[PDB]
Design a protein around this ligand. Structure first.
Ligand SMILES: [Ca+2]
Ligand SMILES: [Ca+2]
Ligand SMILES: [Ca+2]
Ligand SMILES: [Ca+2]
Length: 202
């Protein structure tokens, strides 16, 4: 047993794995040990994050659990190569793991139910309520729209700001309830939904 395991010098150190997948392949390392028999046989282990990653006998690394990018997106993973000698010799490598984002969150409204009380003579053009939804995924841009067709003659919803404005003065349709949506313009998850109730003071 003249020497330790040495990792291949040009193994990638920056590895990326998609969030929300257990048993996902992260990458593969290799350490060689130019020695005869059991002094030349390399075994792999991890020095940290053992509940989150595992390594196989050929140096392939997999997630043990679903990673959540929204909770943490980076791991400095220590890989250990040990030979089979009676006095074992070890070497280590740090890998820098990046967790990649998927669209797994719909926009979430600040309120499940917005309620607003307006004066009967509120002028046409008044913006009287702002709604707001947040999307925790990476690069998301939230846009707003009114789902319910039957109020589209009464109110307009600004697609960027979420400001709700009056199109015509109020008379007899003393409340009106409808659904608003918030969606990631380039996302794939469903829209977030919230109810809006407008109450007219007589
Ligand atoms: Ca050796
Ligand atoms: Ca997630
Ligand atoms: Ca995500
Ligand atoms: Ca999203």
């Amino acid at each position: 047993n003249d020497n330790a395991p040495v990792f291949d010098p040009y193994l990638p150190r920056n590895l990326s794995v998609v969030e929300e997948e257990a048993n996902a392949f992260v990458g593969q390392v290799r350490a060689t040990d130019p020695d005869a028999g059991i002094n030349g046989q390399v075994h792999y282990s991890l020095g940290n994050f053992n509940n989150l990653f595992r390594i196989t006998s050929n140096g392939s690394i997999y997630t043990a659990v679903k990673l959540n990018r929204e909770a943490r997106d980076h791991y400095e993973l220590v890989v250990v190569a040990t030979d089979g000698a009676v006095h074992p010799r070890h070497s280590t490598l740090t890998l820098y793991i990046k967790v990649l984002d998927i669209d797994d969150n719909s926009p979430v409204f600040t309120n499940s139910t917005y309620t607003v009380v307006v004066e009967e003579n509120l002028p046409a053009g008044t913006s009287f309520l702002q709604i707001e939804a947040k999307d925790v995924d990476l690069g998301a841009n939230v846009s707003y729209r009114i789902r319910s067709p039957e109020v589209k003659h009464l109110f307009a919803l600004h697609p960027f700001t979420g400001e709700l404005s009056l199109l015509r003065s109020l008379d007899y349709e003393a409340s009106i309830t409808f659904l608003a949506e918030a969606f990631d313009i380039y996302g794939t998850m469903p829209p977030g939904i919230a109810t809006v109730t407008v109450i007219v003071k007589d």
